[PDB]
Amino acid sequence: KSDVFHLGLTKNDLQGAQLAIVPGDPERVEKIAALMDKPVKLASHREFTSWRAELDGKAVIVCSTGIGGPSTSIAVEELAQLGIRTFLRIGTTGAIQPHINVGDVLVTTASVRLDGASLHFAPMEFPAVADFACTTALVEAAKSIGATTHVGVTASSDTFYPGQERYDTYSGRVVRRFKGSMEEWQAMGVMNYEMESATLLTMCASQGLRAGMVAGVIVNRTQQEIPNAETMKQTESHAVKIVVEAARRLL
Amino acid sequence: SKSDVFHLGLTKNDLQGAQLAIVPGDPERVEKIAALMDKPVKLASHREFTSWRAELDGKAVIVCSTGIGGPSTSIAVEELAQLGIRTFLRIGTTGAIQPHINVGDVLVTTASVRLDGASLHFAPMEFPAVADFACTTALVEAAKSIGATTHVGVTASSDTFYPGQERYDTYSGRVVRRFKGSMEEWQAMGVMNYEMESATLLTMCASQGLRAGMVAGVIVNRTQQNAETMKQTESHAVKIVVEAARRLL
Amino acid sequence: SDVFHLGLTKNDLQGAQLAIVPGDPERVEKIAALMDKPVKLASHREFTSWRAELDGKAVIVCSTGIGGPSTSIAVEELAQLGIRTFLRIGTTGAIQPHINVGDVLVTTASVRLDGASLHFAPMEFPAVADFACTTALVEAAKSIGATTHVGVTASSDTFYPGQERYDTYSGRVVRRFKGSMEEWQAMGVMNYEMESATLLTMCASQGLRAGMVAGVIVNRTQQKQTESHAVKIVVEAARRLL
Amino acid sequence: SDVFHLGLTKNDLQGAQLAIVPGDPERVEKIAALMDKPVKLASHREFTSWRAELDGKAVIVCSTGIGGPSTSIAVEELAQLGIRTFLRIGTTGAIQPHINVGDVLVTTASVRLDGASLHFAPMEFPAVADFACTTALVEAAKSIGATTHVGVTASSDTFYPGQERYDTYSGRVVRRFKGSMEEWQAMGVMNYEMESATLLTMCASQGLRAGMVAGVIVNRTQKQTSHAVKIVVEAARRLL
Amino acid sequence: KSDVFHLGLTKNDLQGAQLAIVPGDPERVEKIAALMDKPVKLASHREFTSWRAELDGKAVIVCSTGIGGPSTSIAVEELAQLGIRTFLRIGTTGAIQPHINVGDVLVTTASVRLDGASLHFAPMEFPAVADFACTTALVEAAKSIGATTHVGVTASSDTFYPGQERYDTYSGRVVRRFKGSMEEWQAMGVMNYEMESATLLTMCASQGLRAGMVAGVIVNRTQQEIPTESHAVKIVVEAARRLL
Amino acid sequence: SDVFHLGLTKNDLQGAQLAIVPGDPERVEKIAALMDKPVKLASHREFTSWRAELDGKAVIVCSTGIGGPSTSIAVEELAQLGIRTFLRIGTTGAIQPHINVGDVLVTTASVRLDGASLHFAPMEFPAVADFACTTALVEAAKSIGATTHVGVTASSDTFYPGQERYDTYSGRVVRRFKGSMEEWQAMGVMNYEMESATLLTMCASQGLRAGMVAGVIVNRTQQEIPNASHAVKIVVEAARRLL
């Protein structure tokens, strides 16, 4: 049975859940659910892996979005059809400000829309802005957990490579629009790049759904020393603790 | 008299160390806001820029009007920033476009739809006209503290009072294609209200390391179709912006 | 009042169909004083209005404030009250080395670096002045022996980054405007100001006549009485347009 | 020949600094024949050029072909050869009910519904005519008693969908242009044609003087009018 | 070990492969690889599942892209870094023309760019056009396999719902830009909707990589909104043979 | 006349459903002369038209003039008259260093640096050639053994600034086009010409088949203007295949 086309879920599967935590990576879903009570796997189809658990006695969904606005737009739409009204994205990210360190946590107030899917919900003039209650819950959760936290604007790119002005690529070329762009965002105070928030925040803010976004910084584009696949996992766990603690305040 | 800036007629000395400005649109509201604080005093008046200084909890605060629209606002914000202001709180009175937003309610704006031109002089359209979290938090908590009925969300910020707000009661009775059917669209997208300065204010601050927020009292609702409630709503939004200022010093 | 902002009724205009529209309220009486029977009508926000008489016909003088948004309110509401011809008068800098302080600029059309013009017509539409108004201004400039430049003005929603000024808090100019001044100079643009794109577009696209004249008081590319000449010119032009 | 398309040398111009530029190559000789000492210069592709004399001064008549792209080639190459003033003379319909067949239209500026104008200036820049040229055209129109309308023209890269014509192979008009004629009409636009946005923009942005006059032959909402041609020649006299 | 950030693959893993078949669904990768010789699983990370196999003695890669331009752009870039120079997308699609039947095979010559990732490689004026040799190989393979085939333009959308003008949704509405859009594309002869080709074709055509695109029709949108190996899959494998 | 500009009636076409469309009116007779029973039909403005016969079937040759606007008139009116397949034969500047003057370039799709294409489809729509037409051109080229390149073409509304030529009256190029040639070059674009974006877009979006081939007359990596036909043979042979 499925009430929706991609996720393979029914309303019954949600057990009344109205909040979903939405990481990008299917493999992180089980790990996040493990911070809560009585987690159980619901489904796995394409990049959409879903689990249900209990937070302070209330059902909550954890469901992966895959990379990018398009897959995110599917997961969010179908979760909304199923009854979800609040979405918390938990991600990993690359900071672009020299003063933001690996291990820091970033809470996004709004995003630069360097994506395409957001435009399928609202014209570019519309802000990709987070819900105030969600953002508040994330900031407060960061204080409860104890973290070095920055709150601000994130650049949300449809690509990992040229849209984040990476030159270490097959072509070594960046299209005109994005040449010099990282320095421009840096000067405008943008904290970081990631790949799903513009779509998530725009589609929710324009349809009466609540969304928030938190990420752990696993690399800094300005520093020469690159952490290993050890320190980066610790950072992940930190931000994950925060998103679950934030969810508790939103039930 | 000496001025450190081109339009406002102010020196750094006039600010006495102020780092926060409350910025209404109308010069006539400047004294009224200043009057709620300690040691209020007139500073200067040039064109639509009337400035007063006051004190909150021993710290200097500025109140300075912006005039109507992004262009005038952009001058005031730039020159105040040159003088040392780092936090800007806009206070306005507004209509509403949602059926359940009532006259007397308070609106705190998280971000704005950019239907202006001046914001593009600071950041490309993809950049969000987003309020500072600390400012928004202070405004929301101030509104709560006095028991106002508060809505928190998105505002549409227009370069015009008439066609950009899809008004047909005009000389031409025409609205350009871009704006035909636009009010119903913003309504469906959850936009609370129209006003005329916030896209410029929020974009220019968010992209230049300045903090900004905005609060407004609702004095009319076209979708729902009085002078007393108007001045009463005013006094309430004003007490909120001053109480928020206290938390941001 | 018949309108939302100006505090005027149709009767206040006494049949006036032409308005001179300076930016600053403090210049309104000065302009009105050059005409017969000048009287104050109203003052609200940055909209100060006076009525006077030119060759037996009523004329309005009304300030717009700074920028297209304020200007669009004044023009709309004056149009409702019966105004059909608008003449902007201002003082300006210049971005061409050959244009000197004391010179007079008549604008045939504007570069649309504003937002409000788009609320009246898409960008493809020209922010063009009315031919009769432009003719009147040029001929009025000539009748007083003014050194006159006639051409294109760049009309910016900002005083700072839109005019590519770097002497600012951030010291930054957004990509769109980086290198822009040199581009407009190479395209023969005379000067920057902040209201004409809105004025000219909203009028040209709604059957209203508009023109603009300005006195050059500074020139950023180079190392009072000028305001008076431009002012005499706009009043003389008004005479020919009644 | 110096220039690549026109087949002309600076010497062919004999010092000419003004060109009258019709769209149709077949109209070039007819305009030249109204002036002194008309001489054929060249004919290549849609570019037919003649020289003549007006009050003792050399003038050029050169066709542009239809559309901004070919217009942009003629203007550029003529500018290379010394032309500094360009007067377009066209034939045109009208989109305003009160504009009659026989009337003359002088264009102050154009709605830029073309592509070539963007190769000279961004869209924010006005496709505006030179004041001196427009004045000369209006004054020449008065001198001969022509019923004249002065104002804005819509300059389209197509004859069909861009002018919201549905009487076509597909019968389709793209979203951008659906309902557009009514919009231009409400905005006071006089007429459609196909060269002025490019002409006016490329000249206004490069220090060249341009103007345009057109005779109305049809009306969307409804050759003695010769009248337009007499006007462009009389205007040229005033611009030498 | 991995020579690339996301795929978990080294150059050595590819064993000289220069062509990749790139389905959207990770679960379809093993199925496609099984149609070829010596299929071997390489890696699975996020939405990127990769197998290697052999076709007429030459190594070939099958690697999923996930849904959408952004994940597609990662897979294509990293595969290119590892030496892949030809990419054949095999997808599922909703047809928007009355005469196109469920089960038909569509070969895309170029795409309507209703995505965002393509703009990260080339400005909108640049065509999202397929490689001629790849398109030819797909058309010729369709003859070899036997299938009802249509060749033409595809609309490639960053969304499954509003960008394909679907109304079976939470909001039940569609933003201005897309209101009435399906009938517009229909009138312009566009065959179908899918979600990866604009990004794939643009990023390849603008970077000296060859790409082709084929899909099996799973629904006809003029009629309905919610929809061994199919003809389309057999066709992409046969086309690969011709491109090695 | 059945149409406003071409001066032709349906009878003039004698059942023709394919047109070869050069830019230059002066080239029409020359192309017609390579086929059977060539007959002049009309000449108005930049539109010169001939009829001829190929393997017993009527074919039209008709000039478009320079640019998308005049091209859009010719194509529309020919469609009204019954033409369903269009083959453009043009001249072009190559922007890749190894492409020789005289080489034949077959266009799969065009960069839309024009305005007329937007009057038929929004910018997101690809200015793509018909597969059958492109196939016929490529196969005709190989059959005569011509040096041929197949790929993307930049199609500009101007000859000068939009093709980043600086040897001009102003010597300036507007921001949008500064550095643009190097960008197209890096993206693999083969060449510049001035009609294909309009032709390919208006045909692909209206159920007409179009193909595009051009002979290289200058290499832009070396000079802006050449010092003071395989392609034609190919367009005619391609036409044979599409009848």
Swiss-Prot record, chain B:
GO cellular component, as recorded: cytosol
Gene3D superfamilies, sorted: Nucleoside phosphorylase domain
Keyword Acetylation: no
Record flagged with keyword Isomerase: no
GO terms of molecular function: uridine phosphorylase activity
Localization (cell): Cytoplasm
Entry superkingdom: Bacteria
SUPFAM superfamilies reported in the protein's UniProt record: Purine and uridine phosphorylases
Root EC class: transferase
NCBIfam families (alphabetical): PRK11178.1, Uridine-psphlse
Subunit comment: Homohexamer.
Functional description taken from the UniProt entry: Catalyzes the reversible phosphorylytic cleavage of uridine to uracil and ribose-1-phosphate.
Similarity annotation: Belongs to the PNP/UDP phosphorylase family.
Protein name, per record: Uridine phosphorylase
Lineage: Bacteria, Pseudomonadati, Pseudomonadota, Gammaproteobacteria, Enterobacterales
Gene name of the record: udp
UniProtKB/Swiss-Prot annotation, chain C:
Source species, domain of life: Bacteria
PROSITE patterns: PNP_UDP_1
Enzyme Commission number: 2.4.2.3
Enzyme class: transferase
GO molecular function ontology, one term from the record: uridine phosphorylase activity
Catalyzed reactions per annotation: uridine + phosphate = alpha-D-ribose 1-phosphate + uracil
Keywords for this protein: Cytoplasm, Glycosyltransferase, Transferase
GO cellular component annotations of the record: cytosol
Family membership noted in the UniProt record: Belongs to the PNP/UDP phosphorylase family.
NCBIfam families (alphabetical): PRK11178.1, Uridine-psphlse
Function in brief: Catalyzes the reversible phosphorylytic cleavage of uridine to uracil and ribose-1-phosphate.
Protein name: Uridine phosphorylase
From Swiss-Prot, chain E:
UniProt-listed Enzyme Commission number(s): 2.4.2.3
Compartments (UniProt record): Cytoplasm
GO biological process: nucleoside catabolic process; nucleotide catabolic process; UMP salvage
Enzyme kind, highest EC tier: transferase
Catalytically driven reaction(s): uridine + phosphate = alpha-D-ribose 1-phosphate + uracil
InterPro entries: Nucleoside_phosphorylase_CS (IPR018016), Nucleoside_phosphorylase_d (IPR000845), Nucleoside_phosphorylase_sf (IPR035994), Uridine_phosphorylase (IPR010058)
A cellular component annotation (GO) from this entry: cytosol
Keywords: Cytoplasm, Glycosyltransferase, Transferase
Recorded GO MF terms: uridine phosphorylase activity
PROSITE patterns the UniProt entry points to: PNP_UDP_1
Biological function: Catalyzes the reversible phosphorylytic cleavage of uridine to uracil and ribose-1-phosphate.
Family under the similarity heading: Belongs to the PNP/UDP phosphorylase family.
The protein's assembly and partners: Homohexamer.
Alphabetized PANTHER family for the sequence: FI09636P-RELATED, URIDINE PHOSPHORYLASE
Protein name per Swiss-Prot or TrEMBL: Uridine phosphorylase
Swiss-Prot record, chain F:
Top-rank EC class of the record's enzyme: transferase
Classification via InterPro entries: Nucleoside_phosphorylase_CS, Nucleoside_phosphorylase_d, Nucleoside_phosphorylase_sf, Uridine_phosphorylase
Keywords, sorted A to Z: Cytoplasm, Glycosyltransferase, Transferase
Biological-process GO terms, alphabetical: nucleoside catabolic process; nucleotide catabolic process; UMP salvage
Superkingdom of source: Bacteria
Keyword Glycosyltransferase: yes
Principal subcellular localisation of the protein: cytoplasm
UniProt-annotated location(s): Cytoplasm
Catalysed reactions listed for this entry: uridine + phosphate = alpha-D-ribose 1-phosphate + uracil
GO molecular function, one term: uridine phosphorylase activity
EC number(s) stated in the UniProt entry for this protein: 2.4.2.3
Biochemical pathway: Pyrimidine metabolism; UMP biosynthesis via salvage pathway; uracil from uridine (phosphorylase route): step 1/1
Annotated PROSITE patterns: PNP_UDP_1
Family statement drawn from the similarity comment of this UniProt entry: Belongs to the PNP/UDP phosphorylase family.
Protein purpose: Catalyzes the reversible phosphorylytic cleavage of uridine to uracil and ribose-1-phosphate.
UniProt cross-references to NCBIfam families, sorted A to Z: PRK11178.1, Uridine-psphlse
Oligomer and partners: Homohexamer.
Protein name stated in the entry: Uridine phosphorylase
Organism: Salmonella typhimurium (strain LT2 / SGSC1412 / ATCC 700720)
Gene: udp
